[PDB]
């Protein structure tokens, strides 16, 4: 049997040498060119156990994106463990690109192709690939942006649904576009627009899938975050090099029993880091129109639990490993033996 194994996965991408955009620059020295001739081989009569919650691929990706950010996005000031560091904080061009992960000789990547795959247990339609599909390393909270959609229907995944402390990862089957803009010419005020009916229909379908999981006699409710750091209370993400903090109360105040949803956003200089515990300060926002149009392809939720009859779900996230998990869930690395 080819047992699961840890190896030196290398990265591949379509990064250009003439792009000063930071993902391109990093990939230029860290990655090889995208596989010109990919080969997926189906393994017949093979069943294989996967575990998306215990996957070294996620750990390796996490380290790479950390290195990417730590070389690319330099804050003017950084506070960690009581130690203060200051440096030149030049603004950069910032737009994530797809990164493929590939297995070196002696190893192979197995891929689960089952449509309703929950993340753990046996897979009956397994194939081997030389590289994963292209994954944009988007760092965000609450909403998963520019990821891959579920093929058939919405899928919800958790390491343990009955444990309310475990994050629930939602994978949509239809994207919901969200446009966030800091208009040209209050330099920190911004806003995010999305279709009201599309979001309401999305929450409606997520609730159905949650009822399947927790009980048909349950009343599903969405409420905003209970509190914490700004990065998790709001939908937070980097756009064009600027850190956005978007109030998502309207998105997550819903129960079963306008045209656009407009969320108020703020651009912040002082942020809590995701790479490590500490704070960082960047220079004020750039002038001109700052704008990103993204596909919402997933959500990160937490359940209140405790005591009864009703189940309240709130936007979650925080550990960026779950972001990487939302794309790497169908992969595992094995050694050829």
């Amino acid at each position: 049997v080819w047992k699961e194994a840890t190896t030196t996965l290398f990265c591949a991408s379509d990064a250009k040498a003439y792009d000063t955009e930071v993902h391109n620059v990093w990939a230029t020295h860290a990655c090889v060119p995208t596989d010109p001739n990919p080969q997926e081989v189906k393994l017949e009569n093979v069943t294989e156990n996967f575990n998306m919650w215990k996957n070294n691929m996620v750990e390796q990706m996490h380290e790479d994106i950390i290195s990417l950010w730590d070389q690319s996005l330099k804050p003017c000031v950084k506070l960690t463990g009581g130690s203060v560091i200051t440096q030149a904080c030049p603004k950069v061009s910032f737009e994530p690109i797809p990164i493929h992960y590939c297995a070196p000789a002696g190893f192979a990547i197995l891929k689960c192709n089952d449509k309703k795959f929950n993340g753990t247990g046996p897979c009956t339609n397994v194939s081997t690939v030389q590289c994963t599909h292209g994954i944009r390393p988007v760092v965000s909270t609450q909403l998963l942006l520019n990821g891959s959609l579920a093929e058939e229907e919405i899928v919800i995944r958790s390491e343990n649904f009955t444990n309310n402390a475990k994050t629930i990862i939602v994978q949509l089957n239809e994207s919901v576009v969200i446009n966030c803009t800091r208009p040209n010419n209050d330099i920190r005020q911004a806003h995010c627009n999305l279709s009201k009916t599309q979001w309401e229909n999305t929450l409606e379908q997520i609730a159905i899938k949650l009822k399947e999981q927790f009980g048909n006699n349950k009343t599903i409710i969405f409420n905003p975050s209970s509190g914490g750091d700004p990065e998790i209370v709001t939908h937070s993400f980097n756009c064009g090099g600027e850190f956005f903090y978007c109030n998502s109360t309207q998105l997550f105040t819903w129960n079963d029993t306008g045209r656009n949803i407009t969320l108020p956003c703020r651009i912040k200089q002082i942020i809590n880091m995701w790479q490590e515990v500490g704070k960082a300060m960047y220079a004020p926002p750039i002038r001109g129109q700052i704008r990103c149009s993204s596909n919402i392809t997933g959500l990160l939720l937490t359940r209140d639990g405790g005591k009864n009859g009703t189940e309240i779900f709130r936007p979650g996230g925080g550990d960026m490993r779950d972001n990487w998990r939302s794309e790497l869930y169908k992969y595992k690395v094995v050694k050829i033996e």
Binding site: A165, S225, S226, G227, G228, D229, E231, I232, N272, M273, W274, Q275, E276, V277, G278, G316, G317, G318, D319, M320, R321
Partner: peptide, 27 residues
């Protein structure tokens, strides 16, 4: 995550604190 500044913060909100990665989260 700093769980203690966190719990010390969340308890002032009527809630318990816990780590969400490198961030503070209230429950």
């Amino acid at each position: 995550x700093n769980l203690h500044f966190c719990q010390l913060r969340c308890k002032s909100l009527g809630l318990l604190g816990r780590c969400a990665x490198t961030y503070c989260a209230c429950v």
